[PDB]
């Protein structure tokens, strides 16, 4: 998320065995990184 010129990153990792879908359950994401970058953002893309 991008707020007041800060780009904030949260994340978590979990073991799974369900290939098909997101698992039905709960676990929260911790803050990892916070970038004071000031960019106006409207679009994004992902690296393979």
């Amino acid at each position: 998320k991008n707020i007041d010129g800060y780009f904030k990153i949260y994340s978590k990792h979990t073991p799974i065995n369900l290939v098909r879908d997101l698992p039905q359950g709960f676990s929260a994401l911790e803050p990892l990184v916070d970038l004071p970058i000031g960019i106006n953002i409207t679009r994004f893309q992902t690296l393979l």
Binding site: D4, G5, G38, N40
Partner: peptide, 24 residues
């Protein structure tokens, strides 16, 4: 502070046009 003793010449190298947003 005033920088008339540093940045004046006049000097045209300084230019102008929001909350921590640049205007490139």
């Amino acid at each position: 502070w005033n920088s008339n003793n540093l940045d004046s010449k006049g000097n045209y190298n300084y230019l102008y046009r929001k909350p921590f947003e640049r205007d490139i």
